[PDB]
């Protein structure tokens, strides 16, 4: 046999070349997996890996035909396609990637097992990241006085806790925090603060899109959560005002799917009671909402901290973590929306349980025309204005009666729905 | 005489290499057909069967260059053309093929006579898909709870069984099916047994992309679709309230016909009643319903049930089902049909031999027009309310008046309809 095709054979052995889905293939360089289209870098590594070879073997990868064969043996030989960004448990950096199983720093050739094509930007270092520092003894008094050690609060702390215990762990997260506080209440003080804590992955953005469609075209929005691992709703927008745009609806559920991957938790700050242009019943299964009932620069600016704050972190995904990710919506805390639900529970359609109870819905006004209970009109309106404070509530009312005017004629005007407190 | 040319020979002669009259060759690797979109992969075929020859014509087959001259002969040997999933009565596997019409499973080399460029992306295997275990036990439990075998469900429960079975999913299949029924009594349950038998061809959407016209645009469902087996609506609340698009039937003719392969069977399911843009000549032929009005846990997660349900589906497509994959319309339980089904049966254009009856109706008041049979306005709008109730049913026949009325010159309009329920 020929010499290239024992070299490239011994290349591949010690891998450093794999093949993906795309059909690209990706090189391990400079400690570092490179990815790319237009320059080819195989003959680059094959130029480079001659060191670690016998010296017959080498003094040949000099002439360029030589390591254009090789590459083109190389090429030929691979045929089964590999996954990347795996294992989301571990965090990568400029020198190694970190385990959150162990807390153990895998560097150099270790960090060849995983195939991670992103970094946090800045080298990695053991000291000071570690349970007990002066910095350790200085730090979570903010945390304390910003999150109020309270009982009733403690839960809201783990829940507050409990969206940094999933700000870096990319498994496709839907769901939506709202850090809800003031001006000088500590809110801001975290913010910025994860860019100290992990840099380059996070990004803060406007309304921007808040109140547009992700889909109107490739701008970089649509580009850059691909590989994000968090993001963080910026500014106050004040929808009461009159030029608001309100809310685009559904852009959350659109995100929601992975691809078109996504791993970028999305956390808005409002100092308001934001409005929505509509309410779907899966809104609440998504949107979480955390307080701050409370109310020296420079030292975080310098990232003494980075990683200082990381220990707790870590500890905060040892709690609560380990096992799940998952995050419990609580719409309860959220106003505007504990309407909905209460009108829901008072207010069912038509289920198969009514057809015997239309014979007593007869005697409660309820009309059996069409098959179906029809109470006239205005008398639910009476009947809800009676049950309710109107107001602000009964343009609401009249809000979802304008979106669900069951009306079979124009002249017969009727509700297909049934009161519950009717029974 | 040639060395490379006796290589070729052989390599032709083990069929491997397939041409598939589109400029592209497939190849037979990794116990897998593949395309040649991508990168060819003739010359990894090659050094990959490299083994299965004598030393003499192996040890010369590592030049890239001979490769290549291996591969340009090759090329020039096929004249020939094949076609690609002929077969509708197998289901790949990952690392084989499931036979249907009689029941077996190859794997390997037994299965390269089957051309199929699809798998369900998982490995099929013996065990746990044989019967006798507590796995098919829940299973027969809750399929005859949440479809009991009662007269009034008889028909229900075949019709539900005819259409899991209705995918052979091997050919272009219309009559797209309906179901209708309570929510939350286990018909929901249903879509994920089916995720995990059939895998990555199944594919579900909701009411998106739906109530418009699919084919503007280069959409990526149309895109996908043309290699897929099963796809189908999920279930949602119709969008009759207001505010809300309408179902297009040109849609439904556009999807009912292979694109210019649409081998997947439609089903629209959902709990609300829903409503109708238009209606014309045989769309009730391509609509059938199954009522589902009758009314585990973690086992689903684990997909546990995964297997078998291939038996139940397998039995059904033995019960009955074999002659053919022909669909029957149910359109008398749904709305707009009942009285367009009457008037079609009420009303019929008028022929030669209905001329002379014409003096019967000249009796009923009715004028001729034109020198020819026809039914004058405004003598049968009352003649309409005696049959059928002014307050439903009014909607309907002005919108058929303002649709079809062959409107004549001023005080001439004519209808070439009689009633054959007065004669």
Same mark, same amino acid.
């Given at each position: 046999g020929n010499k290239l095709f024992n070299i490239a054979q011994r290349i591949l052995d010690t891998n450093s070349v794999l093949l993906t889905e795309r059909g690209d293939h990706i090189v391990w360089i400079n400690n570092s997996w490179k990815f790319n289209s237009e320059e080819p870098l195989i003959t680059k590594l094959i130029l480079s890996i001659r060191h670690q070879l016998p010296k017959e073997y080498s003094s040949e990868l000099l002439c360029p035909r030589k390591r254009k064969t090789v590459e083109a043996n190389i090429r030929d030989m691979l045929v089964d396609s590999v996954e990347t960004d795996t294992y989301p448990d571990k965090l990568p950096f400029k020198n190694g990637v970190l385990d959150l199983v162990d807390g153990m720093f895998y560097s150099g050739d270790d960090a060849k097992k995983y195939t991670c094509t992103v970094s946090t930007g800045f080298k990695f270092d053991?000291?000071?990241?570690? @349970?007990?520092?002066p910095e350790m003894e200085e730090l979570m008094n903010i945390i304390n006085d910003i999150q109020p050690l309270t009982d009733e609060n403690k839960k809201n702390r783990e829940l507050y806790e409990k969206t940094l215990s999933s700000c870096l762990c990319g498994a496709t997260k839907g769901c939506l925090t709202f850090f809800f506080g003031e001006t000088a209440t500590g809110k801001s003080t975290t913010k910025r603060l994860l860019k100290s804590a992990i840099g380059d992955l996070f990004v803060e953005t406007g309304q921007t899109i808040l109140t547009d469609v992700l889909d109107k075209g490739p701008n970089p929005f649509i580009a850059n959560m691909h590989l994000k691992r968090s993001v963080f709703c910026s500014e106050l927008p004040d929808f009461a005002c009159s030029g608001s745009k309100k809310i685009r609806s559904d852009n959350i559920k659109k995100l929601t @799917?992975?691809?078109?991957?996504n791993h970028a938790t999305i956390i808005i700050d409002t100092n308001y009671k934001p409005v929505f242009d509509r309410i779907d019943n899966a809104l609440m299964r998504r949107i979480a909402v955390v307080r701050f009932r409370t109310h020296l620069d420079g030292k975080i600016q310098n990232n003494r901290y980075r990683f200082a704050f990381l220990y707790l972190l870590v500890k905060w995904y040892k709690k609560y973590h380990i096992p799940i990710m998952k995050l419990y919506p609580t719409p309860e805390e959220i106003p505007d929306f504990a309407f909905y639900l209460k009108i829901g529970t008072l207010l069912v359609s038509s289920s198969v349980k009514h057809i015997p109870l239309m014979t007593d819905l007869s005697k409660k006004g309820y009309i059996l025309y069409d098959n179906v209970v029809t109470l006239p009109l205005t008398t639910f309106q009476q009947k809800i204005s009676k049950y309710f404070n109107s107001r602000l509530f009964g343009h609401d009312i009249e809000s979802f009666i304008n979106r669900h005017k069951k009306f079979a004629n124009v002249s017969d005007e009727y509700l297909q729905y049934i009161f519950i407190e009717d029974i």
């Open positions: 053991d000291t000071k990241f570690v @349970e007990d520092s @799917e992975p691809c078109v991957r």
